[PDB]
Amino acid sequence: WTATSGSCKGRCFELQEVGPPDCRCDNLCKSYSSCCHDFDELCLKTARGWECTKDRCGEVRNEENACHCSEDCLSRGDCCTNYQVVCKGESHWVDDDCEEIKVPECPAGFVRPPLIIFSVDGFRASYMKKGSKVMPNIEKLRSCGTHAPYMRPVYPTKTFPNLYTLATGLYPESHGIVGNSMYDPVFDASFHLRGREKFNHRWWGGQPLWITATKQGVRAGTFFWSVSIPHERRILTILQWLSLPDNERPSVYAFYSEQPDFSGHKYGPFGPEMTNPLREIDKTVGQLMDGLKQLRLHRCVNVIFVGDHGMEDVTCDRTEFLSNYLTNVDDITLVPGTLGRIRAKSINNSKYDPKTIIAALTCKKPDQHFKPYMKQHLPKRLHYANNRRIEDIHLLVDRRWHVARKPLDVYKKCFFQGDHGFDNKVNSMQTVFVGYGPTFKYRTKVPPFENIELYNVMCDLLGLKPAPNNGTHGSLNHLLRTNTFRPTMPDEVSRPNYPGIMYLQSEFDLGCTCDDKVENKLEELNKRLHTKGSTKERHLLYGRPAVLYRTSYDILYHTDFESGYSEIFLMPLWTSYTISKQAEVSSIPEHLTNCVRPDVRVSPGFSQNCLAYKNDKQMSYGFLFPPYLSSSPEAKYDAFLVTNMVPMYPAFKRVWAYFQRVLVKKYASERNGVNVISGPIFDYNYDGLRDTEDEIKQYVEGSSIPVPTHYYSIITSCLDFTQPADKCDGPLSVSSFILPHRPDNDESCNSSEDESKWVEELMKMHTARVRDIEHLTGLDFYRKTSRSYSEILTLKTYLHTYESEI
Ligand SMILES: *[C@@H]1O[C@H](CO)[C@@H](O[C@@H]2O[C@H](CO)[C@@H](O[C@@H]3O[C@H](CO[C@H]4O[C@H](CO)[C@@H](O)[C@H](O[C@H]5O[C@H](CO)[C@@H](O)[C@H](O)[C@@H]5O[C@H]5O[C@H](CO)[C@@H](O)[C@H](O)[C@@H]5O)[C@@H]4O)[C@@H](O)[C@H](O[C@H]4O[C@H](CO)[C@@H](O)[C@H](O)[C@@H]4O[C@H]4O[C@H](CO)[C@@H](O)[C@H](O)[C@@H]4O)[C@@H]3O)[C@H](O)[C@H]2NC(C)=O)[C@H](O)[C@H]1NC(C)=O
Ligand SMILES: COc1cc(C(=O)N2C[C@@H]3[C@H](C2)[C@H]2CN(C(=O)c4ccc5[nH]nnc5c4)C[C@@H]32)cc2ccccc12
Ligand SMILES: COc1cc(C(=O)N2C[C@@H]3[C@H](C2)[C@H]2CN(C(=O)c4ccc5[nH]nnc5c4)C[C@@H]32)cc2ccccc12
Ligand SMILES: [Ca+2]
Ligand SMILES: [Ca+2]
Ligand SMILES: [Ca+2]
Ligand SMILES: [Cl-]
Ligand code: NA
Ligand code: NA
Ligand SMILES: [Zn+2]
Numbered sequence: 001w002t003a004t005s006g007s008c009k010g011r012c013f014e015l016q017e018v019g020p021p022d023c024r025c026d027n028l029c030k031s032y033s034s035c036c037h038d039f040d041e042l043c044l045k046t047a048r049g050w051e052c053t054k055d056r057c058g059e060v061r062n063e064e065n066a067c068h069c070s071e072d073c074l075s076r077g078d079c080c081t082n083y084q085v086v087c088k089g090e091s092h093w094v095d096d097d098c099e100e101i102k103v104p105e106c107p108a109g110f111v112r113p114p115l116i117i118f119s120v121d122g123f124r125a126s127y128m129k130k131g132s133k134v135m136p137n138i139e140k141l142r143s144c145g146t147h148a149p150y151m152r153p154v155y156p157t158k159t160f161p162n163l164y165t166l167a168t169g170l171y172p173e174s175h176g177i178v179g180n181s182m183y184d185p186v187f188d189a190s191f192h193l194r195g196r197e198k199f200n201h202r203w204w205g206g207q208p209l210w211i212t213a214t215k216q217g218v219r220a221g222t223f224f225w226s227v228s229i230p231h232e233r234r235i236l237t238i239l240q241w242l243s244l245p246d247n248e249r250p251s252v253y254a255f256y257s258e259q260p261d262f263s264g265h266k267y268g269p270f271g272p273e274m275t276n277p278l279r280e281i282d283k284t285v286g287q288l289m290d291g292l293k294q295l296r297l298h299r300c301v302n303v304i305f306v307g308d309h310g311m312e313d314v315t316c317d318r319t320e321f322l323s324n325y326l327t328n329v330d331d332i333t334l335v336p337g338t339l340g341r342i343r344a345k346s347i348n349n350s351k352y353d354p355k356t357i358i359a360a361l362t363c364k365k366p367d368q369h370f371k372p373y374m375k376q377h378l379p380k381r382l383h384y385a386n387n388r389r390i391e392d393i394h395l396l397v398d399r400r401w402h403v404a405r406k407p408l409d410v411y412k413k414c415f416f417q418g419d420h421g422f423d424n425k426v427n428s429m430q431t432v433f434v435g436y437g438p439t440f441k442y443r444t445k446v447p448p449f450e451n452i453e454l455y456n457v458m459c460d461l462l463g464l465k466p467a468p469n470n471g472t473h474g475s476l477n478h479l480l481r482t483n484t485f486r487p488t489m490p491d492e493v494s495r496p497n498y499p500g501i502m503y504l505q506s507e508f509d510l511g512c513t514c515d516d517k518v519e520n521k522l523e524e525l526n527k528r529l530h531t532k533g534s535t536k537e538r539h540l541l542y543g544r545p546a547v548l549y550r551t552s553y554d555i556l557y558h559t560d561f562e563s564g565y566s567e568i569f570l571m572p573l574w575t576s577y578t579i580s581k582q583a584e585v586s587s588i589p590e591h592l593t594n595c596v597r598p599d600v601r602v603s604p605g606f607s608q609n610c611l612a613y614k615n616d617k618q619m620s621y622g623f624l625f626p627p628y629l630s631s632s633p634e635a636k637y638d639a640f641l642v643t644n645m646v647p648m649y650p651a652f653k654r655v656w657a658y659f660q661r662v663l664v665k666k667y668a669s670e671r672n673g674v675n676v677i678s679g680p681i682f683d684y685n686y687d688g689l690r691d692t693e694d695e696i697k698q699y700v701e702g703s704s705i706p707v708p709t710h711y712y713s714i715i716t717s718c719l720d721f722t723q724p725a726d727k728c729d730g731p732l733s734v735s736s737f738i739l740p741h742r743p744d745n746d747e748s749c750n751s752s753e754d755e756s757k758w759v760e761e762l763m764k765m766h767t768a769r770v771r772d773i774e775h776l777t778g779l780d781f782y783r784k785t786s787r788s789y790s791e792i793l794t795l796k797t798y799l800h801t802y803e804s805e806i
Contacts, residue, residue, distance in 0.1 A: 002034045011036075012043035013237045015222060015250070027237070030226035032199070050232040050287070052080040057087035067236055074294065077243025081235065081291035093289035093298055094137045098144035102481075104438040106300035109246040113438050114301045115461050116238065117223075117254040118288070119166070120281060121159060122261025122420065124269050124310030125150030125430035125806055127278060134275055135282040137289060138434075141305055144443060145436030146479050150806050152450045152799070153309040153431055155382045155424040156339050159261070160198075162308035162451065167208035167223070169455025169469030171383040171688075176205040178389045181335055183343070185388055207467035209458055213252050216464050221253035231257065231284050239291040252462055255288070257281055261420075264311035268417035269428065302437030302461050306454070309420045312399050312428040314338065316414030319402040320369050325360050332357070334405045338421030340370060340395030354393055361395070363749040369401040371747070376686040379766050380710065380738045380776070381799065382424070383470075385686040399426045425767075425801045441481050449476060449797065460485055472771055475793040489789060490780050492546035496555040496564060499601040501531075508604045511611030514595035516637055527634075531601075533557040538726055539577045541675045542716065543784025547573070549690070556601060556643060559635040561625035563644065567606040568693060570705050571646050574679040574779060575624035578726050579668040585661065588627050592640060596621075599643040607642050608705050616701035618743060622648040624678050626660035646680055647700050647707050649743040655762060656711065656739075658755035663763075664715075671717035671733065673725030680708035681738060681776045690778040712738045712773045714781060731787065735800035738768040738776065770796040 001021045008025035017026055020034065025043060029035035045066045048056070056069035066080075069087060073079035084090035104113040128147075132139050141147075154165045154172055158180045161172040172178045182191040184203075191198050210220035221241050225234050238253050259277040267273040285305070292298040322340075323329045331352055335341040344352040354374070361372040373394045375385040384390060397403050399422045404410050422429055430448070435441075439461050456473040459466040460483045466473065477484040540562050547553065552567040561577035596610050613621050623644045630636035638644070648656060668674045682691040684698075696706040714736040718728030739762070745751035750758040770781055774796065782792045 002032075004035070004037050006036045008036045008039045008042045012039075013240070015219075015241075027222050027225050027229060027234075030228055031224075044229065044233060046230075050080060050236075052083045052086040054086060066232075077240050077295070078236065079291075079294060081239070081287040081294070084294050085290065090293070092286060093293045094140055094286055098140065098443075100442045101299045101438045104300050105296075107296055110300060111246075112218075112251055112463060113461070114242065114250070114297070115252045115458060116288070116301055116303050117166075117252075117458070118257075118285065118303060118305045119163065119254060120257045120305070120307045120432070121259065122264045122309065122311045122418075123281075123307030123432050124260075124264075124428065125307075125432055126310075127260070128432055130270070131275070131278040134279045137282045137285040138305065141285070141289075141303065141436045142434045145303075145434050146440040146442075146444045146446060147434040148432075148446050148448050150430035150448045151306065151433040152448060153424050153429060154451060155384055156421045157309035157424050157426075157429040158421050159308055163256075164204065164208070166306065166308065166451055166454055167210075168206040169452050169466060169471040170206045171452065171470050173383055173385060173387040173390065173688075174206060174470065176203055176387060176389065178384075178387050179335060179339075179341070182389045183333075206469070209252065209455060212459060212464050212467055213462055218252065218462055218464060219248075219250040221250040223254040223256070225256055227258065231255075232287065235284060235287045235291060238288070239295065242292075242295060242297060252458075255284075257284065261311065264418040265416050266418070268313045269311040271417065299438065302435065302439050304454075304458070305432065305434040305436070306451075307431030307433075308451075309424075310427075310429045310431050311418045311420050312338075312422060312426070313417065314400055314402060314419035315417055316402075316410055318369070318400055319404050319407075319410055320397075321404055321407055322361070323406045325364055326357065327360075328357075329405060332405070334403070335391070336404045336409065337402050338397050338419050340393075340397060340403045341391035342393040342395070343391045357393060362746050368749070369398040370395045370403045373747075376709075377740055377742070377747070379768075380683075380688065380772055381766070381768050383688055383772075386688065397422060399423070399428060425799070425803060427803045427806055430806060435479055439481055439483055440479060444479075446476075446479055447794070447798075449794075450799075453797065456485070472793050472797050474790045475797045477790040478794065484790070487789065487793075489783060490546065490548055492780075493549050494547040494551050494553065496544075496547070496553055499554050499556075501600045503598070503600045503603060505598060505600065508598035508607070510596075510598060510604065510607060510609035510642065511614065512596040512598065512609065512642060514597045514640060515591040516595065516597060516640075523634075527559075530559040530635075531557055533562070535559055536562055539675075541576075541578060541726060542732075542782045544576075545574050545677070545779040545781050546783055547778065548780055549778040554602060556599070558625070558638040558641075560629070560631050560638060561644075563624070565602060565643050567602075569680070569682070570606060570608050572624055572643070572679055573777060574677050575644065576675065576677045577625050577629070578673065578675045579629055579664055580673040580724060580726065581668055583629060583631075583665065583668055585628050585665050586630060586636070589633075589636075592627070592636070595637075595640040596642050596645060597637065597640050599641045602643055608645055608647075608700075609642075609703065612700045612703035612705060613647070618649065619647050619700050619707065620650050620653060621645050622653050622656050626664065628661045629664060646711075647705060649741065651743055651745050652711075652739075652741050654745065654751075654755060655759050658759045659713070659763065662756075663760065667715055667717075667735075668725075671715075671725065672721045672723065673717060675716045675725050676713055677716075677781065678711065678713040679777060679779075680741075681710040681712055681773070682706060683709050683776055688772070688775050690776055708741050710738050710741050710776070712736065712768065712776070714770055714773060729786075731791065732782075732785070732795055734770060734795055734798055736768045736770055736773060737763050737766050738772060739763065739766050764802040767800050767802065769799050 006023040011025040023036035052069035456471040563572040563575040627639035717725040719731040
């Protein structure tokens, strides 16, 4: 109940929310049907429109007007934004040359440059180039400020998950807004676009920027605007708030535009109808910047122009129906559209079975436009599993397509020509970032970056300590003129042992064999040097990774590779090696096909054993440093050490072998040498974080050898490819992956074909940031480079997407 009989007189767009049944006058009161009776009359004035005209110049104040053109308007803070232009012979902000803003030029009594976040829904990255003719204000922010070619959204590329990730710096699995639609089984409650449940605070996890600011004594304008409040009124409200007394005035503000998303859904991302919405957004930006200029704030405020996601061409005729695959289609509930999430319609149905649903959806039609996954098998770069609101069964839908349960849902629920939600690496889903103001750099282009990073930067802009989040703080320091955040590298927690030769061959009873009893002070001295680390500078180029948790491990040196060998997990945490452009690929000699050799530096008790692999009819093994890339026949023996062995399903070995035999040499040829670091990952609870020993769900049969859920590789070279990877003077280039360690290749529909037809496509789908591997392994890479730490943080957040040009 709201007793709407109170009044909004002197309360219009009040910042504190008043408690029911007292009536509200804040920017969301309409959405609660809670506004006071006179809210429209007093707070949503429209008389005479939004622009001063020559005849209004110097008018007597009429309080009924939407905005004012009287002499007193500037000190009242309610002039129409074009007041000084029409009445005082000023220029529009857009017509002024840009001039570097070296320091904040703020009115007296501003404690810090305000931040204004101008968020645009569905603003695809290519609109910045493609719409530039019709967006001159935005084009001036972009060219004069700091801008990225694009900004990567989070998955799913839907409205609420992305706006809330912008506000919190968290992945959707962590903030809890995992879709535009959700069911939470613990709450037994549904979050829907239409309706009231979404207003309940319990859905919204983490700590969004307005709460971070308020907790730290920084006042915030309310971010949310009832849809019916026109944009001009939203802008005038923000400008009025900026004229509040110092003690009352917020330092952070947000504007939100439903465009261009609204029209993009109707007309497609590039429909002829899209020009007008783009023009109208630009005009709103112009009103804001003219308004700031009138208030002498246009060289004081930091402005961020940011989108939540892009927009793709999607039409009703491009819909896959689960009723074409499933017999039991009425026993499931689907969250449909540009992603699918499936659960049981009824928890009382004992015959529901996810395994049979997955199989019925796997590679059933030649051109099938979605792929099913249990959520723990989705690409780790999506970070889309660790939340009870994410259904166990997920469908990744091809760009341009929809999935639905039955045809009746599509023609009884064609209109739309655009949609979004797809994989956040898809070019059409990318969005925009521009930063303009005293704290941003001048005329600076920065590489693309992910929207999870921005919360930290907004905290930096406001002098706030960010709440714990998924950004890597410092990775965006290069956007900023000042207020950079200068972190220290994390401290290594475990120091390694450096074992020498400590065990005799006969102490090992591992069930391993190797034809290696085949035989010189010239070259016996040489093998000893290699085992003590004499080639380490060639193979460990960026220092050894630091172990950031408590464990027992050994550094093992070899001619061709160095490794950090875990006594707890019985295999390397990492193996590092460099392959030059000139390196040669050889085969595993016949006599060595089944060779596994005890490592006399590592106890039998801390070794794997061959007998366990023999007994495990499902599990085989592979090697982290590949014997194919051995530098010489003698060095090849090192590659068959039991300490270089890792458990691998035969299906996975197909992938791994092709990577090691073919692709590493291919990258070294293309990149002028590469340094590779490979290793296992254990994430049985799909939380994106390294498992402890007691979380491992699978072991090689009859042993304590844990089975990895994934295998990673980090492939680094010189950004200037005229220099070889091992003699690089400047910036680095990296690509990485986190391949799922699966007992079948059901994910790859063409896997019956030669690996040259499917493996590389699999690897691209499972592309990763170094930072993703760090989370998953508790390792910290690039400890010893000649590069600044911020530059290295940026390198660690880099994702190689394999998408053509934006
Ligand atoms: C991305 O960044 C984020 C933020 O840094 C990272 O997420 C953090 O990860 C931490 C480690 O997993 C985790 O720390 C835990 O906190 C528990 C207390 O949590 C509450 O309080 C905080 C602080 O205010 C709050 O943020 C939390 O909010 C979560 O939960 C509510 C729902 O209840 C949501 O509204 C909100 O969205 C958020 O949900 C997300 O995280 C939870 C996990 O907390 C997931 O379950 C959800 O799916 C969703 O992802 C909470 O309100 C604390 O209880 C934990 O401690 C237990 O476990 C450790 C492990 O040994 C141990 O030390 C403790 O003893 C304790 O164990 C006991 O309880 C166990 C569980 O019941 C039990 O099994 C044992 O037997 C023991 O009895 C833990 O320290 C932190 O909460 C989240 N924070 C957020 C915001 O998500 C994230 O990892 C980053 N991602 C990547 C890939 O790097
Ligand atoms: C400016 O910051 C914010 C503004 C806001 C905020 O005011 N809103 C108003 C609108 C939009 C953002 C939400 C989504 N929606 C829709 O009808 C909608 C829109 C586009 C769609 N495309 N496809 N399906 C769609 C469904 C209703 C809400 C909400 C926020 C929520 C969290 C964090 C920040 C927010
Ligand atoms: C977004 O994050 C939070 C939001 C809140 C919080 O005040 N909430 C949660 C809901 C609503 C009020 C905001 C607005 N929005 C809407 O859907 C919306 C926006 C404009 C509209 N016009 N017409 N209909 C509309 C619907 C989504 C957000 C409280 C929180 C409390 C703690 C942590 C986070 C919170
Ligand atoms: Ca949207
Ligand atoms: Ca076996
Ligand atoms: Ca884990
Ligand atoms: Cl959704
Ligand atoms: Na032997
Ligand atoms: Na297959
Ligand atoms: Zn949309």
